[PDB]
Amino acid sequence: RFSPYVFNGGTILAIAGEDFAIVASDTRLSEGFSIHTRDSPKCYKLTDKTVIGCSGFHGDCLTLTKIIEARLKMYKHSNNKAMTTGAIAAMLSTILYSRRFFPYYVYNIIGGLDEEGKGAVYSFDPVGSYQRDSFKAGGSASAMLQPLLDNQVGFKNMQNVEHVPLSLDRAMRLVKDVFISAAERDVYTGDALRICIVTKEGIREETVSLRKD
Amino acid sequence: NQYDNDVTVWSPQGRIHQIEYAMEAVKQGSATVGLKSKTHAVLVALKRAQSELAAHQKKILHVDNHIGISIAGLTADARLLCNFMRQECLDSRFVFDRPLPVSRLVSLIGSKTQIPTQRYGRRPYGVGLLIAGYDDMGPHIFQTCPSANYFDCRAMSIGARSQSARTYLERHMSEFMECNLNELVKHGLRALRETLPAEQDLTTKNVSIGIVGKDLEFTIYDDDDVSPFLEGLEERPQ
Amino acid sequence: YDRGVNTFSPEGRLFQVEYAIEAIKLGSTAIGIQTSEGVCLAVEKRITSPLMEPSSIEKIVEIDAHIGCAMSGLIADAKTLIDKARVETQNHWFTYNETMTVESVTQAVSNLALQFGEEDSRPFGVALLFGGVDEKGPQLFHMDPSGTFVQCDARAIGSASEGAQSSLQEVYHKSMTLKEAIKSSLIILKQVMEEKLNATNIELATVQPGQNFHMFTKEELEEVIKDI
Amino acid sequence: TTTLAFKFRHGVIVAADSRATAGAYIASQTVKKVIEINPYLLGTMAGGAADCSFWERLLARQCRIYELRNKERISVAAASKLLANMVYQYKGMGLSMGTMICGWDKRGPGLYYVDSEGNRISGATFSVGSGSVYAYGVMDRGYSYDLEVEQAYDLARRAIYQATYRDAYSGGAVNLYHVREDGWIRVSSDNVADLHEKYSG
Amino acid sequence: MEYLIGIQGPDYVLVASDRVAASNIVQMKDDHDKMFKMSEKILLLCVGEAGDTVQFAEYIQKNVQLYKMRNGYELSPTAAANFTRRNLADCLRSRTPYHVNLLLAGYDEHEGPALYYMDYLAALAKAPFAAHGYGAFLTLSILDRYYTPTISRERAVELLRKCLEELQKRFILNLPTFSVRIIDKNGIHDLDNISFPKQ
Amino acid sequence: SIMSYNGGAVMAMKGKNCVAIAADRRFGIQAQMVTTDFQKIFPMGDRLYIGLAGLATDVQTVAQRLKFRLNLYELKEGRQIKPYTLMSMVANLLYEKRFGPYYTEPVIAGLDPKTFKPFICSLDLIGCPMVTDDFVVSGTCAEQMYGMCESLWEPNMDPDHLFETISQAMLNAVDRDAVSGMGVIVHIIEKDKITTRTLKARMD
Amino acid sequence: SYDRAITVFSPDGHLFQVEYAQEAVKKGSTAVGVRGRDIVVLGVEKKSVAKLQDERTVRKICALDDNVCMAFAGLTADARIVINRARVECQSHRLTVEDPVTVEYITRYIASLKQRYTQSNGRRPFGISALIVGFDFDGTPRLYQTDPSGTYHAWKANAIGRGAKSVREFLEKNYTDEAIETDDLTIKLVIKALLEVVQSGGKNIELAVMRRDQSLKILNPEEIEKYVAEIEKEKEENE
Amino acid sequence: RYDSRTTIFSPEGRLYQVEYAMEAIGHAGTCLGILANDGVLLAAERRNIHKLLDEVFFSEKIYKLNEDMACSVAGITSDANVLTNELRLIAQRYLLQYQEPIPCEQLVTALCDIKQAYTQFGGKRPFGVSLLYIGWDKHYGFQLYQSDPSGNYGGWKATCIGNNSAAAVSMLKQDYKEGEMTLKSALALAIKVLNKTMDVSKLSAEKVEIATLTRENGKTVIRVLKQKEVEQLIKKHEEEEAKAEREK
């Protein structure tokens, strides 16, 4: 009989900097044991200071993206201003709970700048609970990225090591190293790496190739 | 005088007076002038103060990234049509993932305003909408009326004493297709200064200018950015 | 043709909402002044009886913990408008984790006052003054039964409305302070009311950026009056 | 997941862990499981993340309107009753909610327990969570109504530590709040690994 | 799971319940009350699900008080008992069935004392004694042994104490304390609480 | 089953100029009795009774709904109800719950209001009327009640022997049943009077 | 000229059909009420029994809940709907929120139910005015009043009915800032206030008090006759 | 004027449509109930007793309604059949709910809330029907009540109808009894009151109607007493006139 859900894969990474935010994802879209395309990024520029990532079931990712982009315009003409980073995370929690008994199969991470100019990363669940974190990794390779970033960013289980804040250039090579190691052991990850950098001067993009198998 | 009570009642001359009276509410509001070139469509309005120290009431309001409208008439019918206007613009973005053609959005307004001009229980909308936009075939200047007719035009002025603005537009409409924005805007606001009593001048605090372009999103300038537009003007020949 | 909200005039107009503007005129006076240090606000009580309990007559209500209010005209329609104005600021915080701005409060209020005959009743009989300090600083707004919404720098409505405006436009300027605008406001009040001004005829309400509390004065009002 | 609450002579003590998992996978270690409803009310999170997050935020939406319409704070028994009726309309549809309500009232302290099944009971001591049953024994061995303030801080900090030791779904940090007559106050937030060097030494 | 008892006398009704609010292993509350004063001569005992006990019995509680304030006088215990049966049976073939077990205790000025039994399928009865829960099995044959229709109110308390000691002996659950009421021509009087030193 | 949740037995029997009806007294859940004074025979006007058996909820429910419709019938019309008319009334009430049905099987016994003519009938749980001339039975122990009535019934019987036949039919059949008993009440009516007797049965 | 509608305005901004509803209040029997230290009291006048009827069905003083009272004016039909509706709300409040109902909450329900009942055409408004007296909200004595426009309002001493202007002017010169303690003194204030009745027969006063802890205590025409005697005892000092 | 729908109020200020209905009942039949210990009675009048009718029901003014209550009727007959079918349907809804009869007061207020509700909602007439009430209950015994078009009511011990027979109320006070209120003492009072108010002399039995309600062995029988015993009740009163003239 008909089943309404299917898994598509994907891996999303976000790191809250001191005055920046980095959002990274792969561009591989798959289903079962087939590859649909090798060019399908998960980054979405909502505003000039907020980028969202959407993994999971791809049909709900296309729907939920267009609902949020409609409500950005509905906020603005009612208030003569744009939404903040924390306002979007409060709005998204009500949208995800609004279909509590038929849930979206989407994992969400919002990264961007606050009103003070600092980094902010909000992680989500498919029902709508959230919290502010410093770094999260969502998607199929989520278990292969969280223990390594605890060592390098959070400095957990380390002795006699000072807590220097992560610079921008050091954070770029940490993102480029975790996706090489994750594409080796995971099958839902590869073919590119789209990286979005959110600073006070706009949004930069950068693409790094991976292995194509 | 007994025929002059409802929208339903026809006259023995064949003219419904309630539609004829909603035209008179358009003449209560202030004047506003819209025009276009081959590439750029600019509509310019005129603010009116309420008191000596209250803020001036706004006229031009943003609708979409390629559509902006002016206003003349009742403020109750103004925001009631705006909420119908904004809902239709984002439905084509949500369904078709394209912006609306401007010529077919206004046909939805004439279907919207037709029902309260025929069925009893709702007055006609007293409103004077001027519409500027961009479909795939260039700029457009549209007007509506409470008789639910919509007129495509290349220049139009409606509101209080706007007949003197129409006379300026007819003898300069041959020049509008070629000139660019540095004078096309101040071709338009030379038409507003005949809709004024001859002793005061169009200042920076009582005028709004909205520009939508072929490569330019619809932008509203008011009270600070009008000064690069009001520079380089002559006075009235008094 | 002057007894219907569904009927125009040969000249304009209504002829129904114009009569609703007249219902404000038989109210009580109220003065609000916007200043860069904050927004002060004054009103007249018109207490009828000594047995009449004074704090049951409201003229300043607290819409939110950074937004005050003032009213005149019909009391019965006023309590309807204050109700959703408290709810719409509360629904916005529920879905956005932020305080609704003072301008966008009245956007929600004006969306229902222009629904008197425009559904598928009568218009209201009450003007409102909204003062508050949002992220754009201190603000002061004004509405009417016709839904016409505007920002004012210093506004006086109710009875004695036009007579207050002429004297109020004389002394206002941009570089006022808050403590100057408070004593400037009730010089106008004792010139427009008929009873002798004391601590029981009026009441005050202020709002400040860092002092979002205290939209009321509790017998510090006696100190202001004794130094007039 | 392990929360507890107990009232005594000087108010109410609230304590919880900070670990939220997903199957056998730990999602985070910094989950704030005590939801700050008001400056005079506190709520907990026990069973379901978004279910305890939404409905207590909807309760905080309701208690503010009650304060504006009546010029008075809401009572503790009133807010626990309003939460019980909202969840009961979705009975059987599959909610999970086991929160607690704390706060000072005109009658004094206040402590109620609300389930998603429909149980609304008062009491003096409670402990909710997967590792809740490890916390009843160590608390009741040291509980008294006439405990001191610094003594009550060490009792709840001990009881969360013994619960996170035996349970696998409990760990992270130990939050600790104190409800005073005027309003609640945040006491501290201590890591479990810091307490292990203190308690075993 | 929890226990009720319904000893009826010639001019009195002796009722008692337990004080346990357990959660599946633990005992969260040991002074819980299951006694609902419907009026000045009518009590209510309720045993059932988690939420269905509080929601339904308070719906009856705040509906008999409406009859008192509006008509100036009080319901009889028979009419009050036969209104509770109407609300289960009407709300039984629907999406929300209430799963509670009740017994009603009332005194009438014209009919004397009365006791009514209630199933979770809304079946009325008129019993000289009744009980509920798993402890209803072990205790009612003791009460069937020594019952007399003309019994004093002092022997009924002694018969109630005989009825509860065997529930202390051969019943697996703990159940330490038991609150006791009594209803007569004067009203509802609260007797002393019953506890058990086991060993 | 659902019918076997509380038990019950209702028997009616036609005589010469009279008619009798009998039922049990036991009320109880599946194996545990509660009381021995549960009414299962309800008067609906003079010289006309009705008996109900099945689920104890629908026994008390239908007997109140039928009383609701009977009093509204006997006030719009000054006459009383005919025994054929009540059978059409009950069959309408059961068929409205065609797919939500009440779990009972009614037995109607009574005399004609004008003449002396008796009447007996029984219905199903969805309203199939069935009139006979000798006896109708309903309840859980139905098969035992057919074995007694097919051998003891005589066509033209005085109220003396009609009472003795329905007594021996109820006692010997219900004592074979497990979930029915604890007392038997017998109504025997006629043109002149109504006699109600209770029998000495086994209380186990 | 123009009234004949509750939705139209006057050329000077009035609602005459709302104002005509207050004219129907002035055809009613007067009822007064004061608050005191602990004991609140309210009394009514103009019983006027007509020799052939039972007098327990003409009662003007009812209780909504266990600790709130009610006295009204106007016409008897519209009061019965408002009383029967308010008993439901002061009981359904207790079900949704387990507190007892404050005296302030029930007056907002009566005013708001009379509010929306004025707005829509084809709905004749209530021609009654009510007095809500209750020392319920945590030991604090209060009394409010209503209005056919739908404006709940708080006084400290009140008079309504046919002749309220004389009594309200009487109480302003009589209600001392000295709080009337020794509550029979406060009851004697009402009997002195109700002494200015439309005829002042003496035996046409039905005073009902409440000691803020017990239920309603309807006074008998023997205890009230004793208070009428001591009012004449203080009147002997005029000579 | 102000003779529009029931909404609105008049100025100064009252309700003209309600007043028009309350005057209409004076041009109707005549009904009265009297005091009685251990009983209660009703008395009515047969209008238009023309000799080509059947009277197949033999009860026209009186409608037995629950089991121990009946009612008279006075007013528009089109609205009369609506109320009686509604009022019987109230008492069975109460009986289905509590399994106890309706206690004779809140039945009256249940109708009076229906009769009021047509005075505020537009656009309807009010009911142009006033009617009486007799009954027995557990709490107060024998009772009398008086309906009005406005929904107002009131208990009584003896009452009647207006502009037809408003002078009877003066006779009920002048010949009032209290305590000595047996049924035979009240039936003699009933035929004397209907003698003057019904202006047709000598009081033929086909123009009147008498219904009683007693309390017998806990059953509360209701008697609509037949025309044969009306005869010996009238001739008793005709004899008392010939006895009363001995003082002359």
Side-chain angles (χ1 to χ4, degrees), chain C residues 17-30 46 59 71-74 125-127 145 155-165, chain G residues 11-14:
Chain C
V17 186
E18 182 68 29
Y19 291 161
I21 302 300
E22 184 65 30
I24 305 168
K25 183 63 69 177
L26 45 84
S28 296
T29 185
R46 190 180 289 170
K59 298 295 286 183
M71 66 184 72
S72 293
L74 185 61
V126 46
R155 182 67 176 172
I157 48 96
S159 65
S161 179
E162 197 275 332
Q165 289 295 111
Chain G
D12 56 353
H14 292 87

Side-chain angles (χ1 to χ4, degrees), chain E residues 85-86 90 93 121 124 137, chain F residues 32 57 60-61 65 100-101:
Chain E
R85 189 261 174 191
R86 181 73 269 169
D90 291 332
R93 303 289 180 89
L121 295 175
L124 285 173
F137 294 98
Chain F
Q32 180 182 2
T57 300
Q60 292 178 356
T61 301
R65 297 291 179 89

Side-chain angles (χ1 to χ4, degrees), chain F residues 141-156:
Chain F
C141 56
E143 294 179 353
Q144 292 82 15
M145 293 188 286
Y146 289 111
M148 296 301 292
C149 294
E150 287 290 328
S151 296
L152 295 177
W153 182 70
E154 294 179 354
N156 292 319

